[PDB]
Structure 1
Amino acid sequence: ASPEERLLDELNNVIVSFLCDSGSLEVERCGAHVFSRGSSQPLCTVKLRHGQIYHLEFVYKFLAFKLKNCNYPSSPVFVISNNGLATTLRCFLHEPSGPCLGLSTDVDLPKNSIIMLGQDDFIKFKSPLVFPAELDLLKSMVVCRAYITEHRTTMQFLVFQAANAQKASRVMDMISDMSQQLSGDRSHFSLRDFFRGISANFELGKDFLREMNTPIH
């Protein structure tokens, strides 16, 4: 299982590289049944940390892109759950009880409750908050700021955009040019081209996340 192992390696390392942007990230991986239909094996588990921001939409869509490139039919699922000792993010490569909560600006997350995030949940969250031209991940991205205290756990979902439109556009140019060089104009630039370019140089992904820094009003 080397082709499988390489893909699983890459998927885990997308999370490691892009879920945050600073500090020690506590990412645990673990069975030959991560891809198997009907399995409840997550790819990895991440302990969330008070005050940190997690780039859920970007990582989600990056994982979805790699899976479709490998002809894998399922789309990932993120599960945030609080067991009373800690809040974790579990990244499943497919859909795998306690109250299951939906996305909103402030999701109180008591013990034994979960939040499930899937393919269209980020667009549904953004849809009423941003104008149509800003709806795509390239312009507006959903993040999660963790609020974890002894007396309350709360997942705070925010939409971030670039404050500097010119610098954001310059990063897009670099990514587009990287995609064009791998395949050998701006009018065709797609989410696939975006992740193809970032796949070739992760630093371009870091550049994008760095510019997507301002919560919407």
Structure 2
Amino acid sequence: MASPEERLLDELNNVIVSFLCDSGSLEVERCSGAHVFSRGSSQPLCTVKLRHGQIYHLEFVYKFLAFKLKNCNYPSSPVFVISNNGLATTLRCFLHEPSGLRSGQSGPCLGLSTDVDLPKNSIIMLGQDDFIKFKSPLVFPAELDLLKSMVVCRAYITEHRTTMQFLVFQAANAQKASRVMDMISDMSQQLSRS
């Protein structure tokens, strides 16, 4: 069982499998190691292969993982690392910032932008408040929250170049989104808190 750690790791992997990509076969390699939790981790909760054209709901997954972790009194906040190894582009989900630092470790920890050329041996590092920083100059103050503006990452993988296109999705039928939010609020209100 080892439910304190094992059950949490399983739930997080299930979240990532269920909500990351809305459709298609998700090539995910799960980790079966307690080193996930140990500080200075070099091993991920899960590693997800990225396919050209598919949309990956990054921000929703990230904020959901942060919620689950804070519910379990885990101090650290997660970190996503999208990297090009030369053969394929991989999204690795580390619960805490790894040891691969900005100081000449690989290709610079490229920041967020509308379009990011991701050459071989290069990485993109997404943290806690990077999503809000990226969305700030693109939406009005009321829309900054995830409930109304979601960040997503599309992959443009071609043999001649691989690029990551970060986009911001909103709801067209605001009324229907409001109804779904009403359903979620009802479910939350019914469930018992501590």
- C-alpha distance in structure 1 between counterparts of 2:28 and 2:56, whole Å: 13
* Structure 2 CA distance for aligned equivalents of residues 102 and 17 of structure 1: 27
Unaligned runs of 5+ in 2: 99-105
Q: Which residue of 1 aligns with 2:172?
A: 163
Q: Distance in 2 between matches of 1:169 and 1:66?
A: 24
Give the TM-score of the pair, scaled to structure 1: 0.82
Displacement of 1:98 after TM fit?
2.0
Shift of 1:137: 0.3
Q: 1:87 aligns with which of 86, 89, 93?
A: 89
Q: Report if the CA contact (8 A) 1:99-1:112 is conserved.
A: no
Identical aligned pairs, as a percentage?
Answer: 100
Whether contact under 8 Å (1:100, 1:116) holds in the other structure is yes
After superposition, what is the alpha-carbon deviation per residue over 1:135-190, rounded to whole angstroms, capped at 9, x for unaligned? 00000000000110100100000000000000000000000000000xxxxxxxxx
Distance 1:148 1:54 in 2: 14
**How many residue pairs end up in the alignment?**
181
Task: Name the TM-score, length of structure 2 as normaliser.
Answer: 0.92
- The farther-off stretch of 114-123 and 27-36 is 27-36
The Cα shift of 1:33 comes to 1.2
Deviation of 1:32 (Å): 0.8
Is 2:51–2:157's contact at 8 Å kept on the other side of the alignment? yes
Q: CA deviation at 1:99?
A: 2.0
Asked if the contact 1:80–1:90 (Cα under 8 Å) also holds between the matched residues in 2, the reply is: yes
Q: Is the 8 A contact 2:41 2:94 kept in 1?
A: no
| Aligned mate of 1:72, from 71, 74, 88 | 74
Aligned counterpart, 1:35:
37
Q: Deviations over 1:97-121 (max 9, x none)?
A: 2222100000000000000001101
